[PDB]
Symmetry: D2
Subunit: 256 residues, 4 copies
């Protein structure tokens, strides 16, 4: 159990050493997995290669995939299959909204900002799952990252809250559709973590303080803690579990 | 309480006599409310006028608003304010997805089909709320229609399930944003009803049969039953209630 | 709709003018309903009679029923049926735990304290429903009062939180069992209100302050607001609604 | 990660080879854990010893603890601490209701039957947690078994449904109370499994058939699958997770 030595996972959404998806990569790597990484723009390839040398993987497998492009997602997973073969799962950690939409009054959200968030943060999972399934003929596990703001209205989270609720339903619909193909689809609801996606978010230290003061474990979580739950979900330990959303958040989801 | 004689409501999404929104109109009308109706295309105006004569309203207030158009939503509510004055609330009953997306494997959903459903079925509430609030300077109530498929993966509901989950989160975010303006925003989760939106949906009679056999009240609900709950939500009876999703479904939501 | 003139409701759990159940009584009374009141101990009868003269009911119908006694519940509803006839519904607002259990560490709860809370705060609904149904041969509506602490762990609520979760499940099981008899069973999740049940609860003003600062309506709710939702639930306006838990809490349930 | 060689767990509620808790024991045992077993009555000791020889544990640690007795729970965990030392966690799989209460109309449930179910199926976790914490001075993990009938009204589950809702809230309150002591408390919501607790349950094969036909994985789960999720929850893989209820049910919780 949990020896991932002959398993291969595609990880999407690493930006830097603080990325939640890099906590996932470190844990899967320590368990022996072969890892494939995707990134949005060619400008990020070098820093990502360099970051990933930390894992000492025998081969650096990196692919430019902008999930806004059908062509890039299809072509990318096809190239992954040609280069590395079939895979055992996908870790999805991609989200975006225009910054102006993460501070406004939500009622002022533009149509374009709303659809943009849905496209990147929710639809991306659907097309990734369809293309990744082609590499998983004997089944596999797909995991997406979410936040409690998809379950409750959190101040400022605004359009991303609606995008995460969409993502969370996307996970259940994919679980239903792909279950017969022995592909499980689950989410991790991570507590707040200081990453690049916290940059420009006002009052972020106040959010971190509230968890510390109120959550059952009276502390915040980190990327490795999300990564350990991701290993469980990506592995056969979680074989009977699908369409689930596991909170890795020091118990915050359970209190009011 | 519940005398709606000096109140005005805008109702969006009546297609015909079987529309859920027409059950809402009949109940509000019987309570004495003045009603304003919107419709998508000019081709539908005459049948809608004719249908609405059944309510014997002293004045027929009807406006062409395609919620896919920012201009039409802004201009429409502005014209409503000029013609009838301030309003007390809005009933939103608008949803759409391409039919091909309501029978597929969900994983095969196109980007365009996904975003289309989000645009009409979820974003429409956001822009309607922003424009309607301009007519509600002393506050008001906004109600949207949803389905259990936004909370759970239901077979075939597919892209509409993700759109309804988005709508349901939209309701909570709007409730948070507009609460300080004394505007409440709530949803009704209606059980299945044979309307125009059931047309082409395979196995619809099987869905109706399952409710009859399994729901606590052992019967299906109707449009007037949704309308009675909509009156409660649109009126001051529900003054302490916002961001809520009330199931009008014979108890089906409560069983498994 | 909502003319309750030829309807009779039994209200259980009024202690004084601040009781949530008295907000319910005032609203139902203003709607024209005939009301029957129960109370635990004979010592409370006079103050309750006096309090209830405020409603100017043509007849004072009051019954001593300690819900810990099967005999008193059976005999009480039987006497109600003999004196007033069949009823249209029951409003249940009864809860108790030993004070020592509402401040402890929850893990230190005694077996006796735990079972006491379950007995009064949850089982009471089950036996009341069974005895009340005998007075509702053409159907009716039963409503119970709950708190968000039954859905989430709230500090200090402790054994009452477990008792309310039990009550909330009791409501769904009763809804399923009694639905075929056209008896609906629902809960109201009231926000915090300064009543006799807040007495001795440390930090209660802090709880009230958090709602004011964080809930969508940025204010606390009152007993009349709960009473207006109770009228909706007790009346035919809510005819398609059962096993539901409606939050009357300024939207607090919808945020995090 | 997940090497449980220097860890000790107490497992409560094994009846025979089909017990969910025995699936838990097999998985933890294969991971290298030392196991301690409890049982209700001395009559069961021999069959349990014999069953447990299958695990080839170097020492057979078995204790008679009837969770209805405060003395037996306190004395039992105290004896466990004296014999084996500190422990790393507890797996709780104990439930009971009178059979007459699992087929009735729920509204006919006796006070004694209701409280009995609460006592064994819910309060037992509270006292076990308080006594077990004494053996976990550096922290630990407590896991309880639940069923979807604690979240929704399932036909016939009746008083056990209310008992499981109570258990599920018990888990959140314990998580809050014990979090500062670095003790995590979580539940597993297992899908239906043919065990001794299915004996006498009418229509059990129909329940199993519905999962197979409707759940995302289109199959039922087994005791080992619950055991693998229990290993995750009992180990440090789940370090940021508490007050959670993980569904091991082929995705059934996610559909309607
Ligand atoms: N940071 C937090 O507090 C939490 C974040 N989350 C969620 O976790 C996920 C990842 O968050 P992060 O905080 O680790 O984000 P960050 O470190 O900024 O990584 C964002 C990645 O998302 C990528 N990304 C963003 N947009 C796109 C796109 N259109 N196509 C492809 N990738 C895109 C972004 O470029 C970048 O990856 P690449 O460098 O591989 O491209 C997101 O889904 C986020 O919503 C959940 C709970 C708490
Ligand atoms: N029928 C059912 O089983 C249930 C439906 N619902 C929901 O109820 C709402 C209304 O459903 P309905 O079943 O009454 O739908 P229907 O009678 O077909 O009315 C649809 C309306 O939605 C309108 N509509 C659709 N797309 C658009 C658009 N882009 N802009 C403006 N209006 C649009 C459509 O034209 C039409 O109204 P107008 O004739 O006023 O335009 C929808 O939100 C639907 O998702 C919920 C539970 C159960
Ligand atoms: N106060 C609050 O913040 C909230 C209370 N609630 C709930 O509302 C319900 C009523 O609360 P309250 O705050 O109005 O309580 P209070 O005004 O103290 O009334 C308590 C009643 O509950 C009665 N009661 C208590 N125990 C028993 C018993 N064993 N048998 C019969 N009645 C019992 C108590 O005596 C008394 O009524 P009578 O005077 O009619 O007997 C309770 O179920 C409570 O848990 C919910 C949300 C917020
Ligand atoms: N079987 C199923 O379909 C499911 C069961 N569950 C739950 O799983 C748990 C265990 O179920 P099981 O189906 O494995 O039950 P079974 O194999 O009959 O074991 C019951 C144990 O619970 C014990 N038990 C029962 N009552 C008591 C008591 N008062 N004190 C101490 N132990 C008690 C019973 O004796 C026996 O253990 P011991 O032989 O160690 O004593 C229960 O909490 C049950 O509610 C959840 C989902 C699906
Ligand atoms: C917590 C929390 C986060 C972290 N989190 C859970 C997120 O999901 C962040 C998602 C995100 C998506 N798009 C952008 C940004 C963040 C900032 C930079 C940018 O230009 N676009 O973001 C918030 C935004 C507002 C309020 C709270 C939060
Ligand atoms: C129930 C139920 C409904 C009713 N319902 C709750 C809905 O929300 C229907 C929404 C809907 C949206 N767009 C379209 C259609 C229906 C049919 C005609 C069309 O061209 N587009 O629709 C289903 C579709 C699949 C499965 C179940 C259901
Ligand atoms: C809010 C809130 C309440 C109000 N509420 C929702 C309740 O349900 C109160 C229930 C209650 C039950 N039994 C007793 C008392 C209160 C105080 C007096 C007594 O001797 N026993 O009580 C709390 C107790 C602790 C923490 C928060 C709260
Ligand atoms: C599923 C399912 C189960 C399995 N399950 C999840 C359970 O939790 C069973 C719990 C249980 C508790 N007490 C007793 C029994 C079973 C049968 C023997 C006895 O004398 N008492 O039990 C049901 C009972 C009715 C309906 C469905 C179910």
């Amino acid at each position: 159990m949990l020896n991932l030595e002959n398993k291969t996972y595609v990880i999407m959404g690493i930006a830097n050493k603080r990325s939640i998806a890099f906590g996932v990569a470190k844990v899967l790597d320590q368990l022996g997995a072969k890892l494939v990484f995707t990134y949005r723009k060619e400008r990020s390839r070098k820093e990502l290669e360099k970051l990933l040398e930390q894992l000492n993987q025998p081969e650096a497998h990196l692919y430019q995939i902008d999930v806004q492009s059908d062509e890039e997602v299809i072509n990318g997973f096809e190239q992954i299959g040609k280069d590395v073969g079939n895979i055992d799962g996908v870790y999805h950690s991609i989200a975006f909204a225009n910054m102006e939409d993460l501070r406004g009054r939500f009622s002022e959200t533009s149509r374009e900002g709303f659809l943009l968030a849905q496209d990147i943060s929710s639809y991306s999972l659907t097309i990734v799952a369809h293309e990744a399934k082609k590499l998983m003929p004997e089944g596999g596990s797909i995991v997406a990252t979410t936040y409690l703001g998809g379950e409750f209205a959190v101040q400022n989270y605004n359009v991303m809250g609606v995008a995460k609720a969409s993502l969370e339903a996307n996970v259940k619909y994919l679980a239903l559709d792909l279950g017969p193909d022995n592909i499980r689809v689950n989410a991790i609801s991570a507590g707040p973590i200081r990453t690049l996606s916290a940059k420009g978010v006002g009052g972020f230290n106040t959010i971190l303080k509230e968890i510390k003061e109120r959550a059952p474990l009276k502390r915040n979580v980190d990327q490795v803690e999300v990564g350990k739950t991701a290993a469980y979900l990506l592995s056969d330990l979680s074989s009977g579990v699908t369409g689930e959303n596991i909170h890795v958040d020091s118990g915050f989801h359970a209190i009011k």
